[PDB]
Amino acid sequence: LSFHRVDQKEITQLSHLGQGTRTNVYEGRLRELRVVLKVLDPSHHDIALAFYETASLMSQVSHTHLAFVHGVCVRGPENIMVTEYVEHGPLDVWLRRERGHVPMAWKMVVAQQLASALSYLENKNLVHGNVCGRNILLARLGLAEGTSPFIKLSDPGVGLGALSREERVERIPWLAPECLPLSTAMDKWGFGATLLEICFDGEAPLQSRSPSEKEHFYQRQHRLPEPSCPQLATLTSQCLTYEPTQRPSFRTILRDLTRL
Ligand SMILES: Nc1ncnc2c1ncn2[C@@H]1O[C@H](COP(=O)(O)OP(=O)(O)OP(O)(O)=S)[C@@H](O)[C@H]1O
Numbered sequence: 358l359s360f361h362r363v364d365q366k367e368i369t370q371l372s373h374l375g376q377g378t379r380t381n382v383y384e385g386r387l388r389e390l391r392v393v394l395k396v397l398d399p400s401h402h403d404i405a406l407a408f409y410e411t412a413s414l415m416s417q418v419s420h421t422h423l424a425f426v427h428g429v430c431v432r433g434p435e436n437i438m439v440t441e442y443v444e445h446g447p448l449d450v451w452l453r454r455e456r457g458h459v460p461m462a463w464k465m466v467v468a469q470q471l472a473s474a475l476s477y478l479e480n481k482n483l484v485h486g487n488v489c490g491r492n493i494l495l496a497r498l499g500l501a502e503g504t505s506p507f508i509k510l511s512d513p514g515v516g517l518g519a520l521s522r523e524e525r526v527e528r529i530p531w532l533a534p535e536c537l538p539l540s541t542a543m544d545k546w547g548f549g550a551t552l553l554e555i556c557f558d559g560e561a562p563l564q565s566r567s568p569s570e571k572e573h574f575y576q577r578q579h580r581l582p583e584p585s586c587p588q589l590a591t592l593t594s595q596c597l598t599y600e601p602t603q604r605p606s607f608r609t610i611l612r613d614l615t616r617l
């Protein structure tokens with residue numbers, strides 16, 4: 358309910374960027390700010406409500422590493438979330454294109470930035486539910502001498518609670534295992550999975566596997582792979598622990614990363 362209604366006349370739709378979860382995403386302009394326009398598919402009212410819920414919740418938080426949500430445009434039957442365009446796009450796509458050339462120090466800066474934003478959300482007691490490399494956007498590349506990367510975590514889109522089992526399974530291994538059959542504990546697991554994804558240059562474990570085989574992995578409660586670095590491995594394994602209450606707080610995660 359508490360979100361800004363963007364007028365259709367204030368937005369200009371440019372190029373199609375990709376399909377998202379129940380969406381098509383376009384570059385746009387907001388009268389001018391550079392934005393993305395997330396056009397909801399024709400949906401049951403409960404999906405639209407979950408879409409509105411995200412826009413409302415995201416409009417009331419602020420963080421240097423959270424992408425802005427400008428509001429929602431209702432254009433006839435259409436529902437369009439209007440969010441900040443982040444210059445260099447998704448981290449996973451970028452890492453895959455740049456693989457082999459990204460130092461561990463760079464990855465540790467990015468990790469700390471993400472842990473900072475999630476520590477703030479944990480404090481606000483706000484569930485994200487879609488922490489993954491595709492949703493970490495690069496505002497600054499930080500490869501050049503004297504530079505440092507700068508990320509922004511985007512909104513979760515249609516809230517996890519409204520999605521089907523099939524699309525929850527597709528979100529494995531970022532999806533917390535307790536969510537397969539809503540606590541901020543789930544974002545600790547997504548963080549851990551995103552750290553693995555980053556360490557492996559944008560390739561998450563279990564992505565060459567079928568949906569039924571991802572589901573089976575969780576049902577057997579197999580442990581996800583560890584990175585080579587034992588301190589980093591200690592943190593990822595702690596985050597990627599099946600019992601949610603055994604996952605460390607983001608205050609603790611943040612402290613551990615700062616020493617790395
Ligand atoms: N904030 C942004 N800035 C720049 N490009 C973006 C942004 N958000 C999305 N994109 C682009 O749009 C494409 C589709 O984005 P997705 O994140 O897959 O869509 P989505 O509607 O947010 O669905 P999710 O993340 O499953 S809830 C991405 O591959 C990016 O290239």
Ligand SMILES: [Mg+2]
Binds near residue numbers: 491492
């Ligand atoms: Mg997204």
